[PDB]
Design a protein around this ligand. Structure first.
Ligand SMILES: *[C@@](C)(CO)[C@](*)(O)[C@H](Cc1ccccc1)NC(=O)[C@H](Cc1ccc(OC)cc1)NC(=O)[C@H](C)NC(=O)CN1CCOCC1
Ligand SMILES: *[C@@](C)(CO)[C@](*)(O)[C@H](Cc1ccccc1)NC(=O)[C@H](Cc1ccc(OC)cc1)NC(=O)[C@H](C)NC(=O)CN1CCOCC1
Ligand SMILES: [Cl-]
Ligand SMILES: [Cl-]
Ligand SMILES: [Cl-]
Ligand SMILES: [Cl-]
Ligand SMILES: [Cl-]
Ligand SMILES: [Cl-]
Ligand SMILES: [Cl-]
Ligand SMILES: [Cl-]
Ligand SMILES: [Cl-]
Ligand SMILES: [Cl-]
Ligand SMILES: [Cl-]
Ligand SMILES: [Cl-]
Ligand SMILES: [K+]
Lengths: 230, 216, 233, 238, 244, 219, 199, 213
């Protein structure tokens, strides 16, 4: 028999800093790198899926996930925590569809998912999520890219990177990213930002990439990733 | 239970010198239909108290399991204590009234026979919680048919030998078979004594149909 | 740091022992069980001549035949007193009779160690009551006086004192008690012992005096009547 | 110590200190003695006064017509356990119409007293009881503690200086089985006497007696009702 | 072998070397208790327990360490007896629930499996402490044969031919290995069970003792019960005289 | 409503009329009754309109969520069990009679599920107030392993029969073919009734309606 | 419905009609009322279709878990008990009789009736609305110690006779035979039904 | 449907004198047109000072007597004394009213002594309305018992009778007579009559045979 703790595990330090959120930020800043790029006619999301052994089945688990027909996800941080947020995101997307009969605006999903993240910075007996989310979407004929993080704060991006070498990946994008890309160009500059932080040789098995357009959201097949890897 | 499905008719009880004897026919009816003509409506609770039950059979089988477990639980402790016939009677009374008060009754009438401390026990339990003790017991149509017979004999002879009780019971089952449309000619006799509970196999009462020729 | 239901190596609950200590800061109160009645007396402890005299109530009425003297944390006591008053009237409703002084004290004693943190209600007690109580009254077993502390323990007393000067007043009662004392001597003794153990002089407005005797009900003394018992110093 | 603030914390030695701290509360209370013959079960307890002006504490309590207890330790924990025992005895009579066998009642205490020792924020019961009862199996003397453990005993003593009483009974335990009731109570009183310092002995004000058996229901004699037992006293020797 | 201050207070806290000390300290409580024994024979299972007489004022038969959990199932306990009784109550309810749901006597292995789940549940949280005892479960039927299981504070359960728990679990096991129990009748096994308890017993540290004995085999018709005063005393005499 | 289902060689086919009634008056002449569940699983709803609407949308919502979590082609047997356990919980108070049809790794499948939560798997079925007309046509002309076009025509005839014989049925016959390759939702496949043409003009020259108050809000 | 089960030496035989009805209309003329609860335990369905099927699912659910926990094929007694318990707990809310028959290593081939929440083992059992019209036939046509083929004919004959008389019974006869070796499922079609007096 | 009540008959009578109380009843338990048992007295000892008589639905009467029994013990452990006649009557009122919306089909009469040793009688309805009185009857034949007591004990409708105080002897015959009359007319009254006499000495029971038809 059990009954949980009812007190917050995230409190204010004398400096005015919620240390557990910043400590959760350290968990994502140390995870595998991930990049998202808004590209005028679509969105691209790519991640390092280096399992660091040939024994793994590269096809079994995925890091780039669909939330609905028009929304996708990537993360940097803890895999298990991310899974919780995916499941919650998918349910929120359906809850919205059932009520309004209209694909959830990406902005509205992110707000709802970010609020779940906020809970774990104030609720009792729990630690915050050690994951930052990168959410892409297409609604009203416009591409969207959003970032959610352990704080429960959310941001809108033209392009960004997170995880290992997120600082170097960001400056690279500042110089490299220009508005009004075509989607197929964005997959290149996404894989290029990923190459900056890699360490090893890139095969279509080592990285995972998803795309979002007017036709919806899908993850690229291993054969498609190979064709961009040249 | 709001509406009983499979029912049993009258259960008989009467106490002789050095024990108690219980009778009930092996029939389970579905309305007027005789559905199961070889099922037992009697049980051995322990070695001192026994039970025959009228009404809904599923409710009887439920009460049979609950009482069965209670006896097992008590045997596990092995503290020199066991349920007396009165204790089982008191429990059953409390159980029926409780279920009745929640408007969800166990659809049963019960006869509890027992022998303890040199004294014979015979107790009645209703589905509404009506409980008492009597030298002779008959439920359902038995209360109208068999009970008059038993009382008329017990008035003339209060103490009966086990043999006298047995033949009186067989005589009552004869009347019940003739007069109850919800009865059958297969029945059991249960007996408590110093030695314990003894349930006897399928019995038939002797019938006579010679009055079928006396209509001319 | 520990929980509220923690035993000392000695064998006592810390919060109880600490609640006993809180009473040692409360103003002194005396009860005397006379064969012809019970008298309760207490010091008010005026902090300023601006405070209203009859405003402090450290001796209250529970029932027609029961009086209660209180010491320690006054705020804790008045929660317990309402509970005592509720019990008498619940009992009156159900049984059409007045409760015994023992049963009333026993009822309040049931709330004793009903405190805790985990495995408890939203409004369950967090700590004990920093209060000692003197239940004095007349039932069908003659006049009686009972003493109760935060441990829950309650016992009859022929005479008892509780508060800051507890041991001093206890010794003063010890050498000045006959089980055959009159009520005149009973009020006198309590008034005599009270001035000895106090930091302030005995005034008519400085103290509360109460009597529960067989014939008449519990009585709160009026300033003029107090001046007749303080006439015999 | 840091293994001694909660019941849910095991000591490295393999022990629970908070149970043992509660066991100390029993030893601080005044002594009480329980013993039985083949027909009767007798409780003898020492009432205590905090001052001479206050009355003596109640030590022996009613449970049912066939069961009685003497307490040692915290008052509220004793009163709480007494009310549980009474409620169990009431439910037994309400349902089965027959008195609850002593063995089973004690088993229920053993099960109930165990619960708080295993849950965080809870605490052990700060009282030990001596239970005298009569049922189908004859007279019984039982012992309960802050630890949920319980014992079936021929005779027992718990409280302050109960070791002296324990040794007295241990010498005369073979005596009790053929004892007359009047001789049985004197044995109980004589053991209780050993607990007191040499200066003082048993008085009519500080001795409480509880008796249950084949003859009668559980009865408590306190003051005037107690002197018949005290009178006829072999003198305090050394 | 132990960890101070931090990592050994709660069962919801792992130690740096991957250990739950709260379970291990509860495992220490049983190691301090007097020895309980039980070995599987050809036609049943026998139990033997040394019961240390704390005081001669206690009744012969008090503090029973052999329980009836179900008509066909017997329990032998070692450790904090207060916990041992609650687990005996939990085990009883489980055997009762099984019959209520499925209509027949609980298979012993499953009974052990079920009670073990309950024990284990008290090893995961700060809200509760682990059970401070270890216990054995023995049964016999013609279908399943003789079966013997033992559960410890962690929630682990295994089958046995011979098993012992408590003070001298080691002294007992080496004495059990000597027996050809796979071929021995349960009437014989009692004699040997009785002598191993006597050998195991420390008569110079512990003051004195009583011997508890249990049945569950063909001679009892599949029902678990106590070994009669007659058969016990023959085995007690056997124990004292082959001690030389 | 008339709704029907049919199994053929290469897959399944579902049918429906387009009429909705409020009391005994035709509310909607062109309402859709063949509902999307998965890309290759579809459901026809008969009974209480709002009830067949919400149950079907709820099922589709749970089916997309299931496909997302498994990364696999949704199973029609999953749809059928989700549906019936939902409906059984409501004890028939949700008046939704459903014909669910689709394609799995286990081939073409057709189920019917009643409001109380009972189900059956079969080659052909019909639900709604015009079900009698449809089964009549099916029992008459159904064969195992029919060609798509032979199966499409019989289904049209079954729904047509329902439309013409049932007063609670009308409008167009909607069809949905599901193949191991894909699903074609042939809305208004056949349309029996036509009267849109007329010769009665009832216009009113601006100012025939007498007005007391006028207010204009600029935007 | 008409449903039936018969016990033989090596195992059991379970039969049913293939009709489901709503009022005077038949909504399914080919429905199999023989649901597996485990690998060698089947049950015969009657009464409310939704109520019956719901009981069948929960029974099959619990017996799967119970089977894994014992690491052995569930006892037919155990199976009957779980169906009996659900039927009793909701006797006012669930309206269906389920015959449970099967085979296990402990007790061989067994037949159980659970109507209303009671439990009884019988040498053979009939159920459903059509059972009324064949009570006389089964009493007269029964022999103890029938071969698998004889039991197969006995159930077929009795169900044929019931279906012709009962308006709520119709279609085909579904037969399953459960032995140690396995389950044999066969269907008796319209042309193959035994002929009797029909006038 | 299903009825939670059965009618089992039984009449109960109580009379108060200077130092005594009488509670009397028939021994007949019945249901429909059949007698359950001829040996069912309705009087019940609660204390040495107080006796209760319950009639109506026997299932309710049994459970209610057991509630009172338990409640009597609860009181004495809590208060250190016996529950007085007036206290039991006050408690019974509240117990019966807690079932105001699902009542005990029960007719209770309480007989005993007050704290001054004087005879006390308390009459109840199924729902708990009660008062003290000199004499009262409850049950199936209460209307048969009442008027005779009104005339003889109350001295009602009489002109120059000197108003003699009630004696035990006279009340005993009165109790016997009204039941003899009722047994002749009420089909639910017969078999035997049991009288419970409450006095300072205690409870004495007396049995007189009645019509057995
Ligand atoms: C045919 C047309 C009826 O013969 C179909 O069953 C059709 C089903 C359908 C319609 C639109 C979309 C999907 C599926 N049913 C209706 O047209 C239905 C009629 C109906 C009314 C009352 C009923 O009894 C409870 C059952 C069916 N249409 C409606 O529900 C209309 C829009 N609303 C109402 O009539 C109002 N109802 C709401 C429920 O409570 C009774 C009153
Ligand atoms: C024979 C064919 C006649 O009923 C069988 O009993 C058959 C058994 C069965 C079991 C599982 C799956 C399919 C078939 N029972 C039915 O066909 C059943 C009959 C029935 C309806 C209502 C009842 O009252 C609660 C009891 C039995 N038919 C149905 O349930 C059909 C699918 N639906 C309805 O009739 C809807 N009912 C629900 C209850 O209220 C009346 C309308
Ligand atoms: Cl908390
Ligand atoms: Cl949460
Ligand atoms: Cl995808
Ligand atoms: Cl049977
Ligand atoms: Cl009945
Ligand atoms: Cl009686
Ligand atoms: Cl204390
Ligand atoms: Cl001690
Ligand atoms: Cl759904
Ligand atoms: Cl049959
Ligand atoms: Cl009550
Ligand atoms: Cl009235
Ligand atoms: K019926």
């Amino acid at each position: 028999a059990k009954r949980g703790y009812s007190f917050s595990l995230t409190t204010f330090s004398p400096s005015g800093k919620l240390v557990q959120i910043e400590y959760a930020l350290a968990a994502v800043a140390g995870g595998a790198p991930s990049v998202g790029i808004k590209a005028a006619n679509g969105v691209v999301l790519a991640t390092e899926k280096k399992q660091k052994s040939i024994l793994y089945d590269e096809r079994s688990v995925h890091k780039v996930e669909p939330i609905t027909k028009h929304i996708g996800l990537v993360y940097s941080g803890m895999g298990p925590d991310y899974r919780v947020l995916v499941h919650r995101a998918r349910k929120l997307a359906q809850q919205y569809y059932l009520v309004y009969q209209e694909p959830i605006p990406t902005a509205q999903l992110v707000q709802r998912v970010a609020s779940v993240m906020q809970e774990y910075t104030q609720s009792g007996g729990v630690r915050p999520f050690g994951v930052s989310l990168l959410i892409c979407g297409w609604n009203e004929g416009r591409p969207y890219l959003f970032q959610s993080d352990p704080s429960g704060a959310y941001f809108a991006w033209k392009a960004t990177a997170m995880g290992k070498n997120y600082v170097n990946g960001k400056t690279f994008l500042e110089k490299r990213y220009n508005e009004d890309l075509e989607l197929e160009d964005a997959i290149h500059t996404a894989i290029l930002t990923l190459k900056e932080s890699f360490e090893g040789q890139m095969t279509e098995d080592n990285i995972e990439v998803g795309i979002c357009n007017e036709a919806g959201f899908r993850r690229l097949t291993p054969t498609e990733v190979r064709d961009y890897l040249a | 239970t709001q509406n009983p499905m499979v029912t049993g008719t009258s259960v008989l009880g009467v106490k002789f010198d050095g024990g108690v004897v219980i009778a009930a026919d092996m029939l389970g009816s579905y309305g007027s239909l005789a559905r199961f003509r070889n099922i037992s409506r009697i049980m051995r609770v322990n070695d001192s108290t026994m039970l025959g039950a009228s009404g809904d059979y599923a409710d009887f089988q439920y009460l049979k399991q609950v009482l069965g477990q209670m006896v097992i639980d008590e045997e596990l402790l092995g503290d020199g204590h066991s349920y007396s016939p009165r204790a089982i009677h008191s429990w059953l009374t409390r159980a029926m009234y409780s279920r009745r008060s929640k408007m969800n009754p166990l659809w049963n009438t019960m006869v509890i026979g027992g022998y303890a401390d040199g004294e014979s026990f015979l107790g009645y339990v209703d589905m509404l919680g009506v409980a008492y003790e009597a030298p002779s017991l008959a439920t359902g149509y038995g209360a109208y048919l068999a009970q008059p017979l038993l009382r008329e004999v017990l008035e003339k002879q209060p103490v009966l030998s086990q043999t006298e009780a047995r033949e009186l019971v067989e005589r009552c089952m004869r009347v019940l078979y003739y007069r109850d449309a919800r009865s059958y000619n297969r029945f059991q006799i249960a007996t408590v004594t110093e030695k314990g509970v003894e349930i006897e196999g399928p019995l038939s009462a002797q019938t006579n149909w010679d009055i079928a020729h006396m209509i001319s | 740091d520990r929980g509220v239901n923690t035993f000392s190596p000695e064998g006592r609950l810390f919060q109880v022992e600490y609640a006993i200590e809180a009473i040692k800061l409360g103003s002194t109160a005396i009860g005397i069980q006379t064969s012809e009645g019970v008298c309760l007396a207490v010091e008010k402890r005026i902090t300023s001549p601006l405070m209203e005299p009859s405003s402090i109530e450290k001796i209250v009425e529970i029932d027609a035949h029961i009086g209660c003297a209180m010491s320690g944390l006054i705020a804790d006591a008045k929660t317990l007193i309402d509970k005592a008053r509720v019990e008498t009237q619940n009992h009156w409703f159900t049984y059409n009779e007045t409760m015994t002084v023992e049963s009333v004290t026993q009822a309040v004693s049931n709330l004793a160690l009903q405190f805790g943190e985990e495995d408890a209600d939203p409004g369950a007690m967090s700590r004990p009551f920093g209060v000692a109580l003197l239940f004095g009254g007349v039932d069908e077993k003659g006049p009686q006086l009972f003493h109760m502390d935060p441990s829950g323990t309650f016992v009859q007393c022929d005479a008892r004192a509780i508060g800051s000067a507890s041991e001093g007043a206890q010794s003063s009662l010890q050498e000045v008690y006959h089980k055959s004392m009159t009520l005149k001597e009973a009020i006198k003794s309590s008034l005599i012992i009270l001035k000895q153990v106090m930091e302030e002089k005995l005034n008519a407005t400085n103290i509360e005096l109460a009597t529960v005797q067989p014939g008449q009900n519990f009585h709160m003394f009026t300033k003029e009547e107090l001046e007749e018992v303080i006439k015999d110093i | 110590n840091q293994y001694d603030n909660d019941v849910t914390v095991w000591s490295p030695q393999g022990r629970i200190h908070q149970i043992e701290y509660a066991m100390e509360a029993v030893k601080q209370g005044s002594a009480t003695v329980g013993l039985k013959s083949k027909t009767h079960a007798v409780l003898v307890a020492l009432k205590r006064a905090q001052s001479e002006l206050a009355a003596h504490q109640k030590k022996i309590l009613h449970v049912d017509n066939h069961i009685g207890i003497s307490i040692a330790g915290l008052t509220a924990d004793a009163r709480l356990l007494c009310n549980f025992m009474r409620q169990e005895c009431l439910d037994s009579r309400f349902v089965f119409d027959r008195p609850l066998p002593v063995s089973r009642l004690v088993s229920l205490i053993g099960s109930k007293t165990q619960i708080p020792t295993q849950r965080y924020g809870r605490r052990p019961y700060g009282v030990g009881l001596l239970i005298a009862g009569y049922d189908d199996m004859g007279p019984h003397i039982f012992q309960t503690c802050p630890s949920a453990n319980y014992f079936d005993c021929r005779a027992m003593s718990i409280g302050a200086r109960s070791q002296s009483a324990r040794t007295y009974l241990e010498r005369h335990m073979s005596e009790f089985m053929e004892c007359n009731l009047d001789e049985l109570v004197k044995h109980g009183l004589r053991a209780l006497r050993e607990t007191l310092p040499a200066e003082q002995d048993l008085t009519t004000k500080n001795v409480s007696i509880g008796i249950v058996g084949k003859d009668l229901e559980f009865t408590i004699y306190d003051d005037d009702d107690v002197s018949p037992f005290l009178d006829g006293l072999e003198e305090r020797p050394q | 072998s132990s960890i101070g201050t931090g990592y050994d207070l709660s069962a919801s806290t792992f130690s740096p070397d991957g250990r739950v000390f709260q379970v291990e300290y509860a495992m220490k409580a049983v190691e301090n208790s007097s020895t309980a024994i039980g070995i599987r024979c050809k036609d049943g299972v026998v139990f033997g327990v040394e019961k240390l007489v704390l005081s001669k004022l206690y009744e012969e038969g008090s503090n029973k360490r052999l329980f009836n959990v179900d008509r066909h199932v017997g329990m032998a306990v070692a450790g904090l007896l207060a916990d041992a009784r609650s687990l005996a109550d939990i085990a009883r309810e489980e055997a009762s629930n099984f019959r209520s749901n499925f209509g027949y006597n609980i298979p012993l292995k499953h009974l052990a499996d079920r009670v073990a789940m309950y024990v284990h549940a008290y090893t995961l949280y700060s809200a509760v402490r682990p059970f401070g005892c270890s216990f054995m479960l023995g049964s016999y039927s013609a279908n399943d044969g003789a079966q013997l299981y033992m559960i410890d504070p962690s929630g682990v359960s295994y089958g046995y031919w011979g098993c012992a728990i408590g003070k001298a679990r080691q002294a007992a096991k080496t004495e059990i290995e000597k027996l050809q129990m796979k071929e021995m009748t349960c009437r014989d096994v009692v004699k040997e069970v009785a002598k191993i308890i006597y050998i195991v017993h420390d008569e110079v540290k512990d003051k004195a003792f009583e011997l508890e004995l249990s049945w569950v085999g063909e001679l009892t018709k599949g029902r678990h019960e106590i070994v009669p005063k007659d058969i016990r005393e023959e085995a007690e005499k056997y124990a004292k005289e082959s001690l030389k | 409503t008339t709704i029907a289902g049919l199994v053929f060689r290469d897959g399944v086919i579902l049918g429906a009329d387009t009429r909705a009634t409020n009391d005994s008056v035709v509310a909607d002449k062109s309402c859709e009754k063949i509902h999307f569940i998965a890309p290759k699983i579809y459901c026809c709803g008969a009974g209480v309109a709002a009830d067949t609407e919400m149950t079907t949308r709820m099922a589709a919502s749970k089916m997309e969520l299931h496909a997302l979590s498994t990364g696999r082609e949704p199973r029609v047997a999953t749809v059928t069990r989700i549906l019936r356990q939902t409906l059984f919980r409501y004890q028939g108070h949700v008046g939704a009679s459903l014909v669910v049809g689709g394609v799995d790794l286990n081939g073409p499948q057709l189920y019917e599920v009643h409001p109380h939560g009972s189900y059956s798997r079969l080659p052909f079925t019909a639900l709604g107030s015009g079900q009698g007309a449809a089964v009549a046509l099916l029992e008459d002309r159904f064969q195992p392993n029919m060609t798509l076009e032979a199966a499409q025509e019989l289904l049209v005839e079954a729904i047509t029969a329902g439309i013409l014989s049932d007063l609670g049925s009308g409008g167009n016959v909607d069809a949905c073919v599901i193949t191991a390759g894909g699903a074609k939702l042939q809305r208004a496949l056949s349309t029996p009734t036509e009267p849109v043409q007329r010769a009665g003009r009832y216009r009113f020259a601006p100012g025939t309606t007498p007005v007391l108050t006028r207010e204009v809000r600029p935007l | 419905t008409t449903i039936m089960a018969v016990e033989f030496d090596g195992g059991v035989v379970v039969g049913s009609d293939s009709r489901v009805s709503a009022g005077t209309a038949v909504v399914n003329r080919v429905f199999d009322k023989l649901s597996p609860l485990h690998q060698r335990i089947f049950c015969a369905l009657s009464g409310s279709a939704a109520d019956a099927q719901a009981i069948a699912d929960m029974a099959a659910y619990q017996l799967e878990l119970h089977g894994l926990e014992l690491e052995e094929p569930p006892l037919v007694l155990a199976a009957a008990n779980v169906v009996k318990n659900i039927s009793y707990k909701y006797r006012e809310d669930l309206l269906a009789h389920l015959i449970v028959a099967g085979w296990d290593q402990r007790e061989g081939g067994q037949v159980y009736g659970t109507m209303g929440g009671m439990l009884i083992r019988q040498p053979f059992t009939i159920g459903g609305s059509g059972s009324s019209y064949i009570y006389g036939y089964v009493d007269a046509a029964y022999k103890p110690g029938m071969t698998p083929e004889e039991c197969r004919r006995f159930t077929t004959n009795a169900i044929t006779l019931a279906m012709n008389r009962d308006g709520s019974s119709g279609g085909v006869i579904y037969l399953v035979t459960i032995t140690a070796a396995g389950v044999d499922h066969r269907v008796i079609l319209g042309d193959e039904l035994p002929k009797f007096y029909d006038e | 449907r299903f009825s939670p009540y059965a009618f089992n008959g039984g009449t109960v009578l109580a009379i108060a004198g200077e130092d005594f109380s009488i509670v009397a009843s028939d021994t007949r338990l019945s249901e429909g047109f059949s007698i359950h048992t001829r040996d069912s007295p309705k009087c019940y000892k609660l204390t040495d000072k107080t006796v209760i008589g319950c009639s109506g639905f026997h299932g309710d009467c049994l459970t209610l007597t057991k509630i009172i029994e338990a409640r009597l013990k609860m009181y004495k452990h809590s208060n250190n004394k016996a529950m007085t006649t007036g206290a039991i009557a006050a408690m019974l009122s509240t117990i019966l009213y807690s079932r105001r919306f699902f009542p005990y089909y029960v007719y209770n009469i309480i007989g005993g002594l007050d704290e001054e040793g004087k005879g006390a009688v308390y009459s109840f309805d199924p729902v708990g309305s009660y008062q003290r009185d000199s004499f009262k009857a409850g049950g199936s034949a209460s209307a048969m018992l009442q008027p005779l007591l009104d005339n003889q004990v109350g001295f009602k409708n009489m002109q120059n009778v000197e108003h003699v105080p009630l004696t035990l002897d006279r009340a005993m015959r009165l109790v016997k007579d009204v039941f003899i009359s009722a047994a002749e007319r009420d089909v639910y009254t017969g078999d035997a009559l049991r009288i419970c006499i409450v006095t300072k000495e205690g409870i004495r029971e007396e049995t007189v045979p009645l019509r057995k038809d």
